[PDB]
């Protein structure tokens, strides 16, 4: 049988490119989404048109709450009910917006930024391992976590927490033969609505080609980590950032 | 006028050593506690006997919830109410226990306590501290071993990693206000109460420098340095106080 | 035509595994060696019998000296002489032995070999590779996943490997405008020392979380192959640990 | 009597501040110099005038050569000769200039940038340890911007990374002998003399904490901490003193 993968936030952008590349590689895929139902379905139909019964969707909010654990359990369950197995988990979904220290409430900001970026990955990891051959987890990290954007403390805290989870889970799941790694983009798909003049400011900062990563470039690193070529690699985070993190102020 | 400091979890162990040593340096202190009522009030009496009117207690649960922000605001407010100022915040309080990935508390409670005390409360206290705002600074108690974690401590480790991120992000953001933000990262220090002595020595034997744990006073010493005039250009730094433990391979 | 790669210390162990895998991916290869003449020529012979005129050898001491620059220059020239191009440089050659701080070789000689092979020669080879550029160019440095938790009494080796991290970052930054990527691969425990006894080997094996075994040479080569491939076209200044989780294990 | 310290490149700038501060703390000191004999003696004069026979000078080139070992033995020797003991080694001396990948020969650049910055610390460390209750420690002057290097400064960067490696390996290896080994990592301090005045402001404005460079004395403060009894459990730690500069993205 073909292996199966869960990709969170898979409807658009980087998660979309990861789901596609996984599918092309021979995986059956669960496309998780929160709001982008139409995008998620059309991806699934396209993939199912390539190969019948190889893609399903799964809706869930990943914000931190007393139901998040149940939600994460269900995401993993959906892979097993659809495909009879779950070989790969890709923690891709992410909230990202500034939270200055000095119109959502603070507790909502915490729930959203820490929930999506750290806690949901942790709950998904627990459910993935408990329901368990090349098993692996890939967490989407951030190459700029030690040189953060001003006034993004909660986001940055969530991405640091994810690094800790990657390391902690790699150590703890290694006896079960589940590898746990990360991919850390620098600047990738810029917001659609961000002005070209602003996009160019970011672009210019990147040493390797003065451009942002495509979603496919990020996906390429994910494909490597889940592949047979990375069978000894666990607890590693590969930056895919064109040297951006090497550039001083 | 004497400056004032908030120390979280200051009733016992390292937080107490920190509050004691700030006091001895000239600070008025808010001793925050959750459960350790007796010990809290006892320390404040000791300090107040030494110099009257220089110590208060403040009770608060630092578990994440929709009212954690109000509790954090309150801890800071208590310092202004007692002393008219708040110059130093020490984020010391911490929950610490295993949370295995593969199987009495629900997971949602484990998340609330470990991520709340170790990371979210620090963030909220930082926000409140900065909003109410001389040599201002915050010191976060981090963990020297965060990249070589204890097995089955994923949520604790995640909390401490988040605290590093907070240390860096708040140092950057609060620098224009003249608030410095730094960390102190113990290795093995005061060893948990429910621990055997064969097991204590096991851990002691791993430490290159003197084959022993840090005293609480040794941790406090680094806190004292970071808040002092000798650290005025230091921000976003984490000082490991680990006796070389983090350098030892498996 | 087929791209060409230089692999340093490629006669045996991990360098051979890298040269072989680059060859199987369709590269022409320079097999650099120092003392291992028989093993180097034998590997080129194997590779040549597989596709002719696709492998040469190149002898050079990579100890630091006033002639180390010329020697590194000549290694790169060997690739242009044999193949007309040089697309990939793998800095694999490495000296490895204790240098205790509280104490056959003089200390001068220790510094020359451990800092020379592990750091200075990579720098000089990087310079020569970049200067000779007259496509998908990259350099891969063989680093060490355990550089922040070092073996007792290996200060000079550790200093060299840390310098190599510094090179990887500095060269990635400086060479990116020229389209040359520079990355590292950091093994934990892989092929154990020839001179090591089995009992000692198993002590090391038992520390690895993922499988309680060392990395195969092939598993190291796999990451090298990833970094030079078009699947890594936006990756520069990254060091990929291939350590089975060993660097995560506390004392 | 009183403890003794060796500070390398202590004639000027950061090394002088370190020497002066150690002296004020009550150390007797060896002021190492290569070129700056006048400055070295002038500083010795100022310190002996303060406390009689508490400062001596020592000449040595710290370029890498067949004689560096002998030179490093001498520096440590002169401390034992003058003062009968050697409690502290500060590896401060350092060369700094670009070495583009695409004047001096390369091997001179290597000898200076790797030699002075990394090899001489390693040899001084050996001699210091060989010639050994006490509070013995070594402090290495590192660089906070090591992971975000200046364009075309590869050899310099290699040397400072090697210095981190030495700090770690020596902390591990000497911990059994009660010798601590730590680092202090400045960001932008006293800028190069030849550097334009407009170019200097460019850098000052990047620093989060106060849009200014560290004074030499601020660097020295961190050294003082690390050698003090307040850091007796600290080894293998590197303290950044950079005013947050290393946290700022491109
Ligand atoms: N793009 C870049 O330059 C960089 C990206 N990264 C990391 O890469 C990963 C992918 O990046 P990118 O594609 O740009 O991400 P986006 O910001 O586009 O978000 C991806 C998806 O996350 C989902 N998501 C957001 N909030 C929630 C929530 N509360 N519950 C559930 N799902 C939620 C959304 O699903 P839906 O649309 O269905 O609601 C969204 O489509 C992320 O983890 C990100 O942090 C890191 C560095 C830079
Ligand atoms: N001890 C060591 O070896 C090491 C410690 N550290 C770090 O150093 C710091 C101090 O260590 P240590 O003294 O051992 O800490 P403790 O484990 O003794 O805990 C400190 C205090 O935190 C408080 N706390 C726990 N949960 C809560 C909560 N929900 N709400 C409010 N307060 C709470 C408790 O207050 P109360 O008693 O009033 O209930 C407790 O006494 C911690 O942040 C720790 O992570 C780092 C690594 C090594
Ligand atoms: N093996 C492991 O477990 C680990 C390996 N690594 C790194 O991976 C890489 C490959 O490891 P491995 O295959 O074990 O390496 P080896 O120790 O087997 O050395 C590889 C080659 O280095 C060459 N070499 C040594 N000294 C010199 C010199 N003075 N001049 C020129 N060449 C020299 C030798 O060539 P010749 O035989 O022709 O003389 C030798 O075959 C190295 O960079 C190493 O540090 C990192 C951590 C763990
Ligand atoms: N300046 C800054 O802002 C920064 C400082 N640093 C580090 O801080 C430390 C002190 O910096 P700073 O005061 O600017 O250093 P300098 O560049 O001014 O050099 C300090 C001293 O080193 C000595 N020295 C240089 N080359 C040699 C050599 N070949 N042999 C012997 N001695 C030599 C000189 O002594 P003499 O005059 O007697 O010839 C010189 O005065 C260094 O380790 C540096 O790398 C790192 C980051 C930035
Ligand atoms: N889920 C997401 N996580 C991240 C993390 C980083 C970035 C990113 O780098 N975006 C472009 C750079 C940037 C930085 C700051 C702002 Cl205000 C806008 C854009 C974008 C995203 S989207
Ligand atoms: N609030 C606290 N945070 C920490 C962090 C680390 C340690 C520690 O390292 N303790 C000694 C090692 C250890 C680990 C787990 C247990 Cl159950 C006992 C001892 C102890 C504590 S207490
Ligand atoms: N050129 C080489 N560089 C390295 C770097 C590290 C290792 C390694 O970690 N080997 C296994 C551990 C080990 C410990 C002590 C010794 Cl005497 C040998 C091997 C082995 C090698 S071989
Ligand atoms: Cl030369």
Instruction: Tokens 């207690």: give the residue.
Output: B57
Question: 3-state DSSP helix/strand/coil percent for chain D, to nearest 5?
Answer: 45, 15, 40
Instruction: Tokens 């060392």: give the residue.
Output: C214
Of A69, A87, A182, A67, which is closest to residue A129 (Cα–Cα)? A87
Report how far residue C13's alpha carbon sits from residue C29's, in angstroms, rounded to the nearest whole number: 16
Q: How many CB pairs under 8 A join B and D?
A: 104
CA neighbours closer than 13 Å in the CB half-sphere of residue C6: 32
- Residues β-bridged to residue A4: A28
Report how far residue A12's alpha carbon sits from residue B222's, in angstroms, rounded to the nearest whole number: 47
- Residue C146 is classified by DSSP as T
**Please, which residues have CB within 8 angstroms of residue C240's CB and are 6 or more apart in sequence?**
A233, A236, A238, C183, C184, C185, C186, C223, C226, C227
DSSP A39-78: HHHHHHHHHHHHSTT-EEEEE---S-STTHHHHHHHHHHH
Could you give the strand order of the β-sheet that contains A135-140, starting from the edge strand earlier in sequence? A55-59, A28-33, A4-7, A88-91, A135-140, A178-185, A237-240
Report how far residue C47's alpha carbon sits from residue C16's, in angstroms, rounded to the nearest whole number: 11
Nearest Cα residue to atom 1 of ligand 5: A94
Contact of A75 with A6, CB cutoff 8 Å: yes
Contact of B15 with B7, CB cutoff 8 Å: yes
DSSP, collapsed to helix, strand or coil, labels residue A159 as helix
Burial class, C59, CB count within 10 angstroms (exposed 0-12 / middle 13-18 / buried 19+): middle
DSSP, collapsed to helix, strand or coil, labels residue A219 as helix
DSSP C199-238: HHHHHHHTT-TTTSSPPPHHHHHHHHHHHHSGGGTT--S-
Distance of CA D171 to the CA centre of its chain: 16
- Residues β-bridged to residue D36: none
Where do the structural domains in chain B lie, given as residue ranges?
4-247
Report how far residue B237's alpha carbon sits from residue B180's, in angstroms, rounded to the nearest whole number: 10
| C-alpha distances in Å from residue B200, one per residue of B205, B209, D7 | 9, 16, 39
Q: Which ligand is nearest to the CA of B36?
A: 2
Report how far residue C82's alpha carbon sits from residue A67's, in angstroms, rounded to the nearest whole number: 65
Catalytic choice (C157, C202, C234, C243): C157
DSSP, collapsed to helix, strand or coil, labels residue D204 as helix
With CB atoms and an 8 Å threshold, state whether B235 touches D243.
Answer: yes
Give contacts of D248 with chain A, Cβ < 8 Å: 147, 248-249
Could you tell me the two tokens for C32? 């650099």
Intra-chain end-to-end CA distance of chain A, in Å: 51
Report how far residue B236's alpha carbon sits from residue D249's, in angstroms, rounded to the nearest whole number: 14
- Residue A10 is classified by DSSP as T
DSSP, collapsed to helix, strand or coil, labels residue A240 as strand
DSSP, collapsed to helix, strand or coil, labels residue D225 as helix
Report how far residue C74's alpha carbon sits from residue C37's, in angstroms, rounded to the nearest whole number: 17
With CB atoms and an 8 Å threshold, state whether B173 touches A153.
Answer: yes
Report how far residue C195's alpha carbon sits from residue C189's, in angstroms, rounded to the nearest whole number: 15
Distance of CA A72 to the CA centre of its chain: 14
DSSP, collapsed to helix, strand or coil, labels residue A247 as coil
Report how far residue D123's alpha carbon sits from residue D121's, in angstroms, rounded to the nearest whole number: 6
Residue A142 falls in the annotated catalytic set: yes
Could you tell me the two tokens for D232? 């007796």
Of B32, B25, B34, which is closest to residue B2 (Cα–Cα)? B25
Contact of B134 with B87, CB cutoff 8 Å: yes
Contact of D166 with C155, CB cutoff 8 Å: yes
Backbone angle region of C245, left / alpha / beta, with phi > 0 → left and psi within -120 to 50 → alpha: left
Report how far residue C186's alpha carbon sits from residue C174's, in angstroms, rounded to the nearest whole number: 22
Report how far residue D5's alpha carbon sits from residue C115's, in angstroms, rounded to the nearest whole number: 29
B181 CB near ligand 6 (under 6 Å):
no
Query: B205 in contact with D at a CB cutoff of 8 Å?
Result: no
| C-alpha distances in Å from residue D37, one per residue of D28, D50, D56 | 19, 20, 12
**Please, which residues have CB within 8 angstroms of residue C31's CB and are 6 or more apart in sequence?**
C7, C10, C11, C19, C40, C43, C44, C55, C56, C57, C58
What crossing angle do the helices spanning B68-83 and B121-132 adopt, rounded to 10°?
40
**Closest in A146, A148, A249 to D250, CB measured:** A249
Contact of C43 with C9, CB cutoff 8 Å: no
DSSP, collapsed to helix, strand or coil, labels residue D28 as strand
- Residue D214 is classified by DSSP as P
Query: C139 in contact with D at a CB cutoff of 8 Å?
Result: no
**Secondary structure element (H or E) that encloses residue A25, with its range:** helix A13-25
Report how far residue D247's alpha carbon sits from residue D227's, in angstroms, rounded to the nearest whole number: 27
Contact of A26 with A54, CB cutoff 8 Å: no
Report how far residue C214's alpha carbon sits from residue C221's, in angstroms, rounded to the nearest whole number: 14
- Residues D59, D62, D63, D67: is their CA dihedral positive or negative? positive
Distance of CA D134 to the CA centre of its chain: 22
Query: B177 in contact with A at a CB cutoff of 8 Å?
Result: yes
Could you tell me the two tokens for A234? 């666990």
The data reach a resolution, in angstroms, of 1.9
- Residues β-bridged to residue A138: A90, A181
Nearest Cα residue to atom 16 of ligand 1: A94
How many Cβ atoms are within 10 Å of B49's Cβ, its own excluded? 10
Report how far residue B197's alpha carbon sits from residue B178's, in angstroms, rounded to the nearest whole number: 46
Report how far residue D231's alpha carbon sits from residue D184's, in angstroms, rounded to the nearest whole number: 13
Could you tell me the two tokens for D233? 């459990």
Could you tell me the two tokens for A154? 């909660």
- Residues β-bridged to residue C30: C6, C56
Backbone angle region of B152, left / alpha / beta, with phi > 0 → left and psi within -120 to 50 → alpha: left
Could you tell me the two tokens for A242? 């064109």
Three-class SS of chain B: CCCEEEECCCCCHHHHHHHHHHHHCCCEEEEEECCCHHHHHHHHHHHHHHCCCCEEEEECCCCCCCCHHHHHHHHHHHHHHHHCCCCEEEECCCCCCCCCCCCCCCHHHHHHHHHHHHHHHHHHHHHHHHHHCCCEEEEEECCCCCCCCCCCCHHHHHHHHHHHHHHHHHHHHHHHHCEEEEEEEECCCCCCCCCCHHHHHHHHCCCCCCCCCCCHHHHHHHHHHHHCHHHCCCCCCEEEECCCHHHCCC
Query: D132 in contact with B at a CB cutoff of 8 Å?
Result: no
DSSP C64-113: -STTHHHHHHHHHHHHHHHHS---EEEE---------S-----HHHHHHH
- Residues β-bridged to residue C241: C186
Burial class, D11, CB count within 10 angstroms (exposed 0-12 / middle 13-18 / buried 19+): buried
**Please, which residues have CB within 8 angstroms of residue A133's CB and are 6 or more apart in sequence?**
A87, A177
Report how far residue D78's alpha carbon sits from residue D75's, in angstroms, rounded to the nearest whole number: 5
Residues comprising chain D, all counted? 250
To 5 degrees, how large is the angle CA D202–CA D208–CA D212?
50
| C-alpha distances in Å from residue D218, one per residue of A235, B87, B232 | 38, 21, 7
**Please, which residues have CB within 8 angstroms of residue A153's CB and are 6 or more apart in sequence?**
A99, A101, B123, B126, B165, B166, B169, B170, B173
Instruction: Tokens 């003049």: give the residue.
Output: A197
C138 annotated as a binding-site residue = yes
CA neighbours closer than 13 Å in the CB half-sphere of residue B153: 18
For domain D4-247, give its CATH number from 1.10.287.130, 3.30.1310.10, 3.30.2080.10, 3.40.50.720.
3.40.50.720
B contact chains, 3+ CB pairs < 8 A: A, C, D
CA of A234 to the centre of ligand 1 (A): 23
Could you tell me the two tokens for C161? 């490997």
- Residues B46, B50, B52, B56: is their CA dihedral positive or negative? negative
Report how far residue D189's alpha carbon sits from residue D218's, in angstroms, rounded to the nearest whole number: 9
What's the CATH fold of domain C4-248? Rossmann fold (3.40.50)
Could you tell me the two tokens for D4? 């003794």
Report how far residue A22's alpha carbon sits from residue A79's, in angstroms, rounded to the nearest whole number: 14
- Residues β-bridged to residue A30: A6, A56
- Residues β-bridged to residue D90: D7, D139
DSSP A198-215: HHHHHHTT-TTTSSPPPH
Backbone angle region of C65, left / alpha / beta, with phi > 0 → left and psi within -120 to 50 → alpha: beta
- Residue C117 is classified by DSSP as I
With CB atoms and an 8 Å threshold, state whether C240 touches A241.
Answer: no
| Cα pseudo-dihedral C5, C160, A221, A78, rounded to 10 | 140
For domain A4-243, give its CATH number from 3.40.50.720, 3.40.50.300, 2.40.30.10, 3.40.50.150.
3.40.50.720
**Please, which residues have CB within 8 angstroms of residue B204's CB and are 6 or more apart in sequence?**
B188, B211, B212, B213
**Closest chain A C-alpha to D35 CA, distance in angstroms:** 32
| C-alpha distances in Å from residue A223, one per residue of A16, C24, D149 | 13, 21, 31
| C-alpha distances in Å from residue B17, one per residue of B40, B217, B220 | 12, 6, 6
CA of D112 to the centre of ligand 8 (A): 12
The bridge status of strand D88-91 relative to strand D55-59 is unpaired
Of D228, B42, B24, which is closest to residue B5 (Cα–Cα)? B24
How many Cβ atoms are within 10 Å of D48's Cβ, its own excluded? 14
**Closest chain B C-alpha to D216 CA, distance in angstroms:** 11
DSSP, collapsed to helix, strand or coil, labels residue D138 as strand
Give contacts of C238 with chain A, Cβ < 8 Å: 238-241
Instruction: Tokens 């932008």: give the residue.
Output: D188
- Residue A194 is classified by DSSP as S
């Amino acid at each position: 049988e073909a292996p199966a993968a869960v990709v969170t936030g898979a409807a658009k952008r980087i998660g979309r490119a990861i789901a596609v590349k996984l599918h092309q590689t021979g995986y059956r895929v669960v496309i998780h989404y929160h709001n982008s139902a139409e995008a998620a379905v059309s991806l699934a139909d396209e993939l199912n048109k390539e190969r019948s019964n190889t893609a399903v969707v799964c809706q869930a909010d990943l914000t931190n709450s007393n139901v998040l654990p149940a939600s994460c359990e269900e995401i993993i369950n959906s892979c097993f009910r659809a495909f009879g197995r779950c070989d790969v988990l890709v923690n891709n979904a992410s909230a990202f917006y500034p939270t200055p220290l000095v119109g959502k409430t603070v507790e909502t900001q915490v729930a959203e930024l820490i929930g999506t970026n750290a806690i949901a990955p942790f709950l998904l990891t627990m459910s993935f391992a408990q329901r368990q051959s090349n098993l692996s987890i890939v967490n989407l990290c951030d190459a700029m976590v030690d040189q953060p954007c001003m006034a993004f403390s909660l986001y940055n805290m969530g991405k640091h927490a994810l690094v800790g989870l990657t390391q902690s889970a790699a150590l703890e799941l290694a006896p079960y033969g589940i590898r746990v790694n990360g991919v850390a983009p620098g600047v990738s798909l810029l917001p659609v609505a961000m002005g070209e003049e602003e996009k160019d400011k970011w672009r210019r900062k990147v040493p390797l080609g003065r451009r942002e990563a495509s979603a496919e470039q990020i996906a390429d690193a994910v494909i490597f980590l889940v592949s047979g070529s990375a069978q000894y690699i666990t607890g590693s985070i590969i930056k895919v950032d064109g040297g951006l993190s090497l550039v001083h102020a």
